[PDB]
Every structure is written in structure tokens, then in C-alpha cells.
Amino acid sequence: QWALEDFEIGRPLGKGKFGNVYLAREKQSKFILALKVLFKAQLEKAGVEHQLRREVEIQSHLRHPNILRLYGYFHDATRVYLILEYAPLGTVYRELQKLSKFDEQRTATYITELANALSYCHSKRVIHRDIKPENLLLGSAGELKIADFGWSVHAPSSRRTTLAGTLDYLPPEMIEGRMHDEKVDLWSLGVLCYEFLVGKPPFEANTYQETYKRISRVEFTFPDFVTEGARDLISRLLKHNPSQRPMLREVLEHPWITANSSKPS
Numbered sequence: 001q002w003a004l005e006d007f008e009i010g011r012p013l014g015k016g017k018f019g020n021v022y023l024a025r026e027k028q029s030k031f032i033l034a035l036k037v038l039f040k041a042q043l044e045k046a047g048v049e050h051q052l053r054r055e056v057e058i059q060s061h062l063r064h065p066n067i068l069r070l071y072g073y074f075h076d077a078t079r080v081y082l083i084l085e086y087a088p089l090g091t092v093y094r095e096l097q098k099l100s101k102f103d104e105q106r107t108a109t110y111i112t113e114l115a116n117a118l119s120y121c122h123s124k125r126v127i128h129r130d131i132k133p134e135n136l137l138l139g140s141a142g143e144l145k146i147a148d149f150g151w152s153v154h155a156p157s158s159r160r161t162t163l164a165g166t167l168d169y170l171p172p173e174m175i176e177g178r179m180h181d182e183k184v185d186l187w188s189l190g191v192l193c194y195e196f197l198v199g200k201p202p203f204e205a206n207t208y209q210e211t212y213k214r215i216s217r218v219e220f221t222f223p224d225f226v227t228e229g230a231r232d233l234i235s236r237l238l239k240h241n242p243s244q245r246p247m248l249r250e251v252l253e254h255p256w257i258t259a260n261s262s263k264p265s
């Protein structure tokens with residue numbers, strides 16, 4: 001069906017390990033979208049063909065306002081092209097660099113939209129497993145949208161591909177190669193809630209080795225400015241034992257969330 005010839009290409013929207021994401025307009029419809037480019041050689045060298053199919057299969061079939069749409073794909077002997085919904089206000093990552101910390105209203109609102117989208121995913125026992133600021137994008141009304149489903153799967157699962165980059169958002173069971181389920185996304189939710197309010201993730205250290213120690217032993221402290229209700233919700237999500245982590249309904253109806261968030265469940 002579609003091919004490169006159908007699109008005018010504009011400025012780069014961002015870069016990832018494999019992905020190079022461009023602004024684009026489809027010639028006859030004038031439809032604006034984002035084109036994610038993957039190099040076949042690189043995919044093959046790394047052997048993540050299976051992750052790509054997972055990304056395409058899972059994301060194309062999900063429909064939720066807080067989840068980024070995937071419309072289609074094509075390829076061309078050197079590259080694979082994913083056709084994505086364009087998010088015009090950029091990443092949560094960028095917004096955090098700009099402002100340093102989010103206030104309590106902004107944080108709770110983001111956590112609600114996340115919990116809504118994740119609840120929807122978990123209801124088809126899809127777990128995302130790569131929830132972090134550079135994979136959270138913003139729509140034209142500033143609403144959060146989960147993107148990058150390259151690491152997603154069905155639960156329960158094992159991990160067998162290598163974790164290349166940062167540990168900062170992964171629970172103990174996942175970094176230890178043990179087996180995991182849905183509850184991994186709830187841990188990452190606690191990691192995000194802290195980073196939103198403080199400006200850095202709770203287990204951040206100077207080395208891989210030290211970061212790994214701090215996650216497995218759940219070693220973090222709060223700054224004085226973090227209120228009691230935020231401490232309460234964050235302490236609940238960062239349980240070593242997955243089973244002791246809350247359900248998502250318990251996150252959405254937590255008092256701190258209800259007092260501060262400006263969108264509903």
C-alpha cells in the first residue's frame with residue numbers, strides 16, 4: 001500500500017536507539033503525521049525483529065485517548081517505516097527539562113491519564129514495560145499519551161532480550177531477570193510520580209552497578225517539600241514485592257490524586 005513517495009518529509013521530531021522520527025504530510029490528503037524510521041541492518045544486527053512485530057501488532061489495535069495511534073507501516077530494502085499519530089506538544093521529558101519540577105496539580109493530572117491508559121492496556125493483559133518521560137507524548141490540549149510499545153508483551157512473561165540502557169524505571173523482578181507481570185507498570189508509575197515532583201528519579205546513581213543495588217534494596221529518600229499524601233502514594237507503589245503494589249483503581253481513587261488532579265477516572 002503506502003510508500004515513501006506518498007509523503008513530504010519535514011523536520012526531525014526526535015531520535016531513539018533505532019527510531020528516527022520525522023514530521024510528515026501525506027501528499028493527496030494533506031494529512032499530518034509522524035514517520036518513525038528503522039534501519040533494517042540495525043534491527044537485524046540487534047535481533048529485535050520480534051519486538052518490532054509486537055510494537056505494530058499491539059499498538060495498531062489499541063484505541064484510547066491517552067494512547068498514541070499507530071495507523072500502518074511499509075518498508076523498502078533498507079528501512080521500515082511506522083505511520084504514527086503526530087503529538088504536537090512534544091515529550092514529557094522535554095517539559096521536565098524546561099520546568100525542573102512539576103507542581104502537585106500537574107503531577108496528579110498526568111498520573112491520572114497514565115493510570116487510565118494503563119488500566120485499559122492491562123484489561124487486555126498487555127503490559128508496556130518501558131514507561132518513562134521520553135515515551136510520554138503530549139496532544140494539542142496538553143493531554144498525556146503513552147507511546148513506544150517496542151518493549152510491550154502479554155502477561156505473565158520472562159525477559160530474554162538484554163536491557164541496553166537505563167535501569168532507572170524498572171522493578172527488582174525485571175532487573176533480576178525473574179519473572180514479572182502487570183505489576184511492573186505500577187512500579188514504574190511510582191518512579192514517575194516521584195520524578196515529576198522532585199526532578200530526578202528515586203534510584204538514580206552514578207553507576208550501573210550502584211543503581212542496580214539501590215533498586216533491589218528499594219533505597220530512596222524524599223526531600224522535605226514532598227507532602228504526606230504524595231509520600232503515601234509513592235511509598236505504596238515502590239514495594240519490593242509485586243503483590244503488595246496497589247491496583248490501578250486504588251491509584252485513581254487515592255485522596256492526594258482526588259484532591260489534586262484536574263481530570264477524572
Ligand SMILES: Nc1ncnc2c1ncn2[C@@H]1O[C@H](COP(=O)(O)OP(=O)(O)O)[C@@H](O)[C@H]1O
Pocket residue numbers: 013014015016017018019020021034036068084085086087088090091134135137147148150
Ligand atoms: N508521534 C510522535 N510525535 C512527536 N514526537 C515523537 C513521536 N514519536 C516519537 N517522537 C519523538 O521521537 C523519539 C523516539 O520515538 P520512539 O518511538 O520512542 O523511538 P524508540 O523506539 O527509538 O525509543 C521520542 O522520544 C519523541 O521525542
Ligand SMILES: O=C1CCC(c2cccs2)=NN1
Pocket residue numbers: 002026031033071072083
Ligand atoms: O485513521 C487513520 C488511518 C490511517 C491514516 C493515514 C494517514 C496517512 C497514511 S495512513 N490516517 N488516519
Ligand SMILES: [Mg+2]
Pocket residue numbers: 016134135148
Ligand atoms: Mg522510545
Ligand SMILES: [Mg+2]
Pocket residue numbers: 016148150151
Ligand atoms: Mg523502541
